[PDB]
């Protein structure tokens, strides 16, 4: 038996995101501003 072997193949490798998904201040700026 072997201690460790890789059981996956990468198609999308994790990488540094370029834009935030949370806040998105412009989206929150326009949305709640127009509601009022």
């Amino acid at each position: 038996l072997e201690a460790s072997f890789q059981t996956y193949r990468y198609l999308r490798t994790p990488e540094e995101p370029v834009k935030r998904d949370s806040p998105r201040r412009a989206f929150l700026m326009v949305m709640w501003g127009a509601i009022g």
Binding site: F5, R9, S22, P23, L28, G33
Partner: protein
């Protein structure tokens, strides 16, 4: 009135913890990278079970 809600939303954005997301997608592994496990499962299924038991099952690939 709109400016007050705009300021409220701006403060809420400044207060909420920022969440950055990383996305990965994976597929089945290569035969080479499975290592000796590939041989150790073939010794168990490819010869032993079928020849010495005749179970006639349907099973997926090792990978």
């Amino acid at each position: 009135i709109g400016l007050l809600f705009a300021v409220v939303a701006l403060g809420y954005s400044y207060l909420v913890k920022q969440e950055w997301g990383a996305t990965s997608i994976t597929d089945k592994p290569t035969v080479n990278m499975l290592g000796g496990y590939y041989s150790q499962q073939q010794f168990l299924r490819n010869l032993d079970a079928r020849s010495f038991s005749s179970p006639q099952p349907e099973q997926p690939s090792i990978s």
